Amino acid sequence: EALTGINGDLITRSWSASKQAYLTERYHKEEAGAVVIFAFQPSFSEKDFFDPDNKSSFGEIKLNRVQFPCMRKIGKGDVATVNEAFLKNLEAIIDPRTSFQASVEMAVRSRKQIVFTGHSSGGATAILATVWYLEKYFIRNPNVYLEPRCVTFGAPLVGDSIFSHALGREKWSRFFVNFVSRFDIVPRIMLARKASVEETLPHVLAQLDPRQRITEFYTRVMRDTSTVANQAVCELTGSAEAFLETLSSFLELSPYRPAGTFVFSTEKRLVAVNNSDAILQMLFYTSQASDEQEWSLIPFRSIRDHHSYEELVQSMGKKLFNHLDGENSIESTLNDLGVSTRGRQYVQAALEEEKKRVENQKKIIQVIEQERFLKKLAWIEDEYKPKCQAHKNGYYDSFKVSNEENDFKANVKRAELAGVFDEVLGLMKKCQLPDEFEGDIDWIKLATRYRRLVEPLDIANYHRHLKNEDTGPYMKRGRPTRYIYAQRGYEHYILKPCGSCFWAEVEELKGKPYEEVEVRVKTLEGMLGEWITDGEVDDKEIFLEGSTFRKWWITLPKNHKSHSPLRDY
Amino acid sequence: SSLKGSALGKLVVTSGLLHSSWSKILEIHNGLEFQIHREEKFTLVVFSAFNLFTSASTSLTYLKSELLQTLKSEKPVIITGAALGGSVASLYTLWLLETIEPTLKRPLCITFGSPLIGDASLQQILENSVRNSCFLHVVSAQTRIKMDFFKPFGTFLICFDSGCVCIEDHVAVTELLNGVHDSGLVDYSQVLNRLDQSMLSLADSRLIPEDVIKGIEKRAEMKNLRFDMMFKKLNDMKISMAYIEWYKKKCKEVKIGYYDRFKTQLAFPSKEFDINIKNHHKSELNRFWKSVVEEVERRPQSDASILKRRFLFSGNNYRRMIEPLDIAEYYLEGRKEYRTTGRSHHYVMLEKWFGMESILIEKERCKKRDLSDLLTFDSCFWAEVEDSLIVINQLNTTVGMRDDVREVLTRKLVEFEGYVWEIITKREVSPEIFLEESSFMKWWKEYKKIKGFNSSYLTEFMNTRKYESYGKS
Amino acid sequence: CLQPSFDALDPNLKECFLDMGSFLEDQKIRASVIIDMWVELYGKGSSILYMYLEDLASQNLLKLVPLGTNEHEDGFYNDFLVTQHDILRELAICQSEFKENLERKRLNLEILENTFPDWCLNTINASLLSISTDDLFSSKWLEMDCPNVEALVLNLSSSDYALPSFISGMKKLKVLTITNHGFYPARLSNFSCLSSLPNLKRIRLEKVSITLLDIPQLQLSSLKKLSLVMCSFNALSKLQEIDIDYCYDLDELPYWISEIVSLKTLSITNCNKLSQLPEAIGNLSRLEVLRLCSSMNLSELPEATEGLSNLRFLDISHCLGLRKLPQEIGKLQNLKKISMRKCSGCELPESVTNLENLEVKCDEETGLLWERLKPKMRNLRVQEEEIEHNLNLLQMF
């Protein structure tokens, strides 16, 4: 109850509700004191795992950005990928006809600690329901809305690497728990291809439903999972990236990745792993048989252990509990589960890569916490800008004329900042920084303060040397990705409950017929009015006599200047 | 590490390429053998030594055209072969890779123990290139290759009694193949069956000793840190370029260009600053950009040999700003024909790499902009000017000339002034050439006396004192 | 104004400020010349004179600008630059105007194209007199017997200049200053005159082209320091320092420099045409400091550095050409400081594991490279400093 946070009473009640929900093919609501449990009904059919309308080799559909805003990478922009049938069942049970939303609202009104339980196919819907409840009510106020838990038994994989990254960034991975046994085909059935098991699905699915082909089915599943297990560690280590690129397009792998806390179970021990990558390697090695006699009865035992989840509840306290990631001496606890020796080093490397990532984060924060780094920003914001404002010009045109000597200092302590910022960006892009680092408010504030002070000088340097004539406009191509990353991060941080390119527009509208740039001029005049008050652009520099914006507003026709909102001069 | 190679070998053996390749090769076996087998997933053909390749040159060209037409459909094609068929297929794919674009599907050749003799000179061009990624050699543990001058190229999949591991280092492949070649060739079908049985097995031992993996691992960190140290040196190279920019800006104040100033202080060293500009802020940039060009040409940073735009965008400015300083040193020694014989390689490489992507851009120009800080688009411009001077003096010093050499030198002067007016009309040259003590005005003064009765619109533009308005608002 | 500010300063500081007016007006002088002049003339220490220079810079009397990232070391003040304003120089020269030419200690002599000053004919008892020659000067002046001269400053402007004869009349001259401020390397001759003066201690030569072996032919024992700046190339018993800076035609160092046993600091700075060093440099006995800064064409260092027993301070610097270090440095026990800034192409030999008690000053990458042997070496005080990209080199443009 330390590395997970769940007691035995909640597990017992959730298991009882999941067992009782096997009837009527509907969700069962059970209220006890403060806890309100919702047990989703399982579905055992060939269409429940793979959607008939989907024509891809794997059940895949990109999440709609309107429904799930937080399930995306704020840097790249790639949305997550989930199963289609589970999502369809989710919006089917979420419709007002099923009255699930009313029950959820009634439970969130007075009760607290809402937990979601379900069986094999019920856990797949319970995970998505917990995600929906987190994105609807929890994201508004973490203190008002109690932390919703989720306990599933043998549910298959539902999200991909993007889903796990989005869960880890918002620190929501501590609310999901999935119980998996040593021999269970359901948690590992989604990694197999739809065409590989197209014939064997209905028979084994009807057999696993309560109330010769199995061997080939299990062999195909394990063979399809072995490729993913090997490619995962090959991409994590980076060995033979060119060979991986050559062999990647030849075959199609399932992008499903385990998400949330997993609790492996057996006769005597209860191992819990919190690493997203380690579980993928552990599943294949735990499903393996040591000798041929165990492999002979491997399918008959795997199809039988899928229902033997009631013993886990009664014998929870008697079993040994240990954490793999936090505690050391993983040799004994990994050998007791059944993993061989060669998988132990794979698991240890998958665990040590996270420690190396944390060490890289510590190095980055120690580098940015120095005084030499902040000295450049201090000199820029306290020495150069005020002394340039003292004259009859701004720090934008003074950097373009480059008459005095301080402009060389601005160039050097702008390139020196751009170098380290691009280094940090390349570190965070190549999967070398933790998922929470981008969610840190300190890094967001630092990136915003760096952008709002360096991007004007960057545009001045870009336009003062006529580089736009050879590299096209600055806004289209020629803008560093660090500014876009910082802008998207700041927007997602302020909108979870740009003005920096303002000059980049003024340089484009200058020297153009007024009849052609009507909409652009008026849109800029409408936007900078709020860009002044929110803090993106400054009111003093743009309104000086020597500023380029004043000359651009003067050269505009008097008809537009009379009705212009920014009439200050 | 060793387990990473074992995981790669397990992936490629469970993928099912080797079984189908061996089966198809032996079925074609059951000179030069050409296969036109087409599959729904990917095309797999078996080509089963210089004379044999040269004899089928027409068939090789036809097959290369067919393979290009097939790869145009975004379909991967793999060429395999027997012992000699492996070398034949390797030569064929090495010849075809030059025409095949890296953006399209790259052809992958898979050979089962083909002994080929290729000297280290051929291995040096593809030391870290992506060509090693095309060829995959799988050999038995007992079978080896006896090579003294030959160097192994490409990834080598070495199989053992249990499993197979891939080696991506040439030194490790040479160390493993240090023994003499084995005349006996075992059946690869039994080897594939044993590899499949080992992949089905839960445990697999590590056959590579620590001395083999040690050198590979320690070379890994240096070959991976060279990239990032160049990435971080780009920033102080930018500062050196800023130093040179400020030097040029200060030199502009005096009525003389920076090219002529460099040329005159190279012969009369003084003032203690041009020495630092020449020896400190110039050699660093040259060495760094030469290394960057060599590394990008060897191994691409992205597809289709596309280096990062941050690198090439700055390399273009570097070339356009530094090449005249090298032209000065080249022509001061007395050498001629710089644009053809004396031009460096990395300059032309950067020019081609910028011209490739210079079409997709949406650039547009307006005449009202100030061109004072504009850089000359043709960096070899000065390389022509000096040449014309070598002609002009040649007309005055040597008396008793044959009139035909006079005529061809007059034609050279005419084409030179035509090119000058062409690049002036398009506004593609810097206005620092019209300075008082600039070399262009000296050339014009030397050419005005020789021109005489002949007249052109360039002469009128120069005499009317309209060159002052050029490049200004 | 000027007189009250001069009187408010220290007496020694005021005398040094008054003597600083010997240089030409609106000129750019390096601090080493003034430092050596004040050390040999007044006799005070070099550190306290550097402190006096800093104090005069604090009072805005003179302008001191550094041109090198290296800090103020012991005996190395060549990178720094000291310029004076025209008004301050005129105010300093205006003092002691009532005193006669021979009565005043500091004198200024201005020469014409062919005419000579009236004071050059008669004898002058001044200890400090400077002669300024234009380009048209043919070294024709009246003879003067002035044995009291202890400091002589020459401002050359001719391509072919002849040394005056009355230098042989001088008896207790201590420093010689020859600075060619023309447009071409000046040619000099008639060196035997300086061979007659037996009390010359420090000789400085700027922008004068003379043959190298004519200096040992002088056979002067009193000489202690020799400097050569921007010069296109048992006799020396007490010569201790040889400064060769900014020589562009220096392909190889001459052989006579190696034969002397009394050198202790051999500085080779900004010599970008020298790629090889002779082995005879290892025959030197007591070389304390061996500077090779900014000589970015020096390929590798000779083996004879192993023979350097008392090489305490080895001021290596941004030498890009350096690619190899000697195989045995550990035999140099007295070595204390090594700077490897911007020069990482050379690989640290195994001998670095042997020598201990080193204060290494390098950059980030060189510091990280040296940190590989940090657990092996004992108490290696690796220090990483900062580089300040300044634009002060645009004054000597």
Ligand SMILES: Nc1ncnc2c1ncn2[C@@H]1O[C@H](COP(=O)(O)OP(=O)(O)OC[C@H]2O[C@@H](O[C@@H]3[C@H](O)[C@@H](COP(=O)(O)OP(=O)(O)OP(=O)(O)O)O[C@H]3n3cnc4c(N)ncnc43)[C@H](O)[C@@H]2O)[C@@H](O)[C@H]1O
């Ligand atoms: N004509 C001149 N006349 C006189 N002096 C000159 C001249 N020219 C240079 N100097 C001097 O050279 C010094 C530096 O040279 P200099 O030439 O190196 O000049 P600077 O680089 O310091 O400044 C250039 C400005 O251009 C923007 O930078 C982006 C961005 O940084 C990167 C992608 O960014 P990223 O997205 O992070 O890269 P990736 O992640 O790899 O993208 P991916 O490949 O898709 O993955 O491209 C860069 N970029 C875009 N366009 C250009 C371009 N036309 N030229 C060079 N870089 C470009 C940014 O506004 C910067 O002010 C300057 O200080 C000058 O003193």
